[PDB]
C-alpha cells in the first residue's frame, strides 16, 4: 500500500490542478440549454394526439 498512497497523492495532484467554473456561469448555461430545448420537449408542449403513437385513437360505428 506504499506505492498506492503515492498514487493517491499524485492523483490529488491531478484533481487539484483543474480549472473550475463559477456556479453562476454554469447554471446560466444549463438554464439556457433547457430554454433552447424546452420548445422541443413534448412533455412540456403536448403534441396533437394524431402525431402521438400513444394517443392516436378514434372510432365510432
Amino acid at each position: 500500500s506504499i506505492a498506492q498512497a503515492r498514487k493517491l497523492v499524485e492523483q490529488l495532484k491531478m484533481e487539484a490542478n483543474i480549472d473550475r467554473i463559477k456556479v453562476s456561469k454554469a447554471a446560466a448555461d444549463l438554464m439556457a440549454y433547457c430554454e433552447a430545448h424546452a420548445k422541443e420537449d413534448p412533455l412540456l408542449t403536448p403534441v396533437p394526439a394524431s402525431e402521438n403513437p400513444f394517443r392516436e385513437k378514434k372510432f365510432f360505428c
Binding site: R20, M31, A38
Partner: protein, 339 residues
Amino acid sequence: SELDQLRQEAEQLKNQIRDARKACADATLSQITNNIDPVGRIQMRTRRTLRGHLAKIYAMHWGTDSRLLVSASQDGKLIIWDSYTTNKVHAIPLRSSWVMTCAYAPSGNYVACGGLDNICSIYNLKTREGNVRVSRELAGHTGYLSCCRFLDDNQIVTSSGDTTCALWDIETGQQTTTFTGHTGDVMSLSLAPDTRLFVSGACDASAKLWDVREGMCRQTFTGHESDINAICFFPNGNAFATGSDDATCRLFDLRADQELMTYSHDNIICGITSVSFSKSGRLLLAGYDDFNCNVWDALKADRAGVLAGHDNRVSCLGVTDDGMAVATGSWDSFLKIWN
C-alpha cells in the same frame, strides 16, 4: 511517519478543495430558481402496459428507432417489443436465472446482457441464416456485472464488482482498456453524447469521471452517506445526477465540480429505484420503493406528480430518445408506459 504526513496533507488538499469550492459557491441553484415558476402538476397516465415477463424486470433499453425496445426479467427471458404496436419482436430464454443488465447496439445489429456470470453475452439478431443466436461471450471480469455500454460494434464498456470496469475489443474479446479506482461495487455508468467521457458510481461513497480515450479519473464527487445505487447524466453533458441510499438525489456539474440541487422529502421514507429526465430536463422522474414513483420539477425539485401503478420497487425506467413516452419496469412483472 509519512502516512500521517500524507493523511494530513490529504486533509489540507481536501480543505484546499473545500476552499476553492466554497469560493465558487457564490450562490446556489435553489436560490436562483426560487424565482422560476413550478412546472405544475405532471400527471402522465399509463398508456401501454407491457406484460409477458413472468417476474421482476431488471433492465430495458430502447432501440435507436424509438419503436423497438429490449427488456430483461427474472423470468429468464429477454423480450424485444414493437412499442408502437407493443408486439413482441424476440423472446430470448436466458442461460442464467440472474441477469442484472441489458443493452442494445445503437445500430441494433447486436445486443448484450450479463450478471453474476462474469460474462457479457452478446446476441446476434440478424444472423445470415435467419436466426437469433449468441455471437460473443465477454469473459474476464471477476465480479458481478452491474452496467455496460458499447463504444462501437467492436468495442464495449462494462462494470463489475471486483473494483474494476473494462473496455473490450469485441472482435478481440479481451479488455482494451481498464477503468479501475473505485473501492466498492461499481453500479452504473453513462457515456457522453460525444462518447469521449463517462462517469461511474460505486459503494466507496465516491463517483468518478473517466476519459474514455485516456481511462484515468478526472473528477471525484461525494456527499452521499451510503452506496450510490444509480447515476444519470444531464442531457447537455456538462452535468449529471446521482442517487444513493441516503434518501437524496443530487446534481453535479462538470465545470462547477460540485452539487447544485438535492431531491428528497420528509414524508418520503422509502428509497428511490430509478431516474430519468424530460427532453429539456425540467422534469426529474424518480422511482420509489413504497410502490410509488414521484415526478419532480428538476429545476425546482418540487414533486410535480406521482406515477403509482406498481405494487413493488419500480426497478428501472427510461424515456424514449424522442421524449414521446416513458417506460418503467417493476418487480410486479409489469412494464408501464407513461405520457
